Design a protein that fits this description.
The structure is a homodimer of 178-residue chains.
Chain A lengths: L7 H28 L1 H6 L3 H28 L8 H30 L4 H29 L4 H28 L2
Helix pairs in contact in A: 1-6, 3-5, 3-6, 4-5, 5-6
The complex binds calcium ion (CA) (2 copies).
């Protein structure tokens, strides 16, 4: 695993296995949007907010994941502490969600899509809330599984949050639009 | 910040600023999609592959960056070696891009959208290629900027890959689908 020693194909071999697993998971995302593609054609403006909504969720989780990983390493927390972290993180995620939601809803207003105003705002609270919890619990899960959290955590929270983020957004959109 | 000692309001305060900065950059993605909303209405089928494409790009960059951060941290590489890393990583990205593209094109076929097969296939090669180089060069730039790459590299690449990723995909979409 010496990069300077390593070669282009050699670098390819180690990395490819990992990325291929993520893309297969990423493929599930495309299938999700198909049921809600009916809804998507009705109001095109849904497509715009998808990357930022998922992106924000991704940031929220990784932040939480990083904090928990650090504390776990320095024994601030022990694997037993995860339930307490859960109850705590709900409050933190909630506050973050409403705060970040106020930011994004304001943009939707500027953009000029009123119907999207309720859809995006509620979702982001929900996106941030769930993504946060996934973020904190992932290191506890990984440590219990005997895997170093650092290497695997970051792409995992990103991909899980992207998927979870889509379902909430689309379902909320469907309910409010049908 | 000691996590266990901290409280829900306290945890909220530190976290928000970084997330708020990130969401503002994340907002740029929606605005991008607006110009290409012209393109989007033409084919509803574009919206599906957007999250996986941005998601795949995000993993690729963070993967490469992590290797670079590690190698630079353990003095495998010197700031001077960035040219050599560039030529090497571009080769890696081409192969990775080509491999993952082949996978996704198969999915697009399963989904049943033939016209989208070339646009998504070509774009994903391009996304992975750039994301790989961006990933490797980011630690070199930040280290040169005199700030430790590790903490900041990850969210940066994530938002950058989303924006760059959108432009590549949509512009390619514009060209091939008029
Ligand atoms: Ca992302
Ligand atoms: Ca349409």
């Amino acid at each position: 695993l010496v990069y300077s020693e390593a070669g282009p194909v050699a670098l390819w071999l180690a990395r490819v296995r990992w990325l291929v697993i993520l893309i297969l998971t990423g493929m599930v995302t495309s299938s999700i949007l198909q049921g809600f593609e009916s809804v998507l054609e009705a109001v095109t403006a849904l497509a715009f907010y998808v990357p930022v909504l998922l992106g924000t969720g991704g940031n929220t989780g990784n932040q939480s994941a990083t904090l928990i990983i650090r504390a776990l390493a320095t024994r601030d927390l022990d694997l037993r502490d995860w339930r307490r972290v859960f109850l705590k993180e709900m409050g933190v995620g909630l506050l973050l969600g409403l705060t970040l939601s106020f930011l994004l809803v304001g943009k939707v207003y500027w953009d000029g899509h009123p119907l999207l105003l309720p859809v995006v705002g509620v979702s982001l609270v929900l996106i941030v809330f769930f993504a946060n919890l996934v973020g904190a619990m992932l290191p506890f899960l990984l440590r219990r599984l005997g895997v170093d959290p650092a290497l695997v955590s970051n792409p995992l929270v990103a991909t899980l949050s992207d998927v979870t983020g889509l379902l909430i957004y689309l379902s909320v959109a469907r309910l409010l639009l049908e």
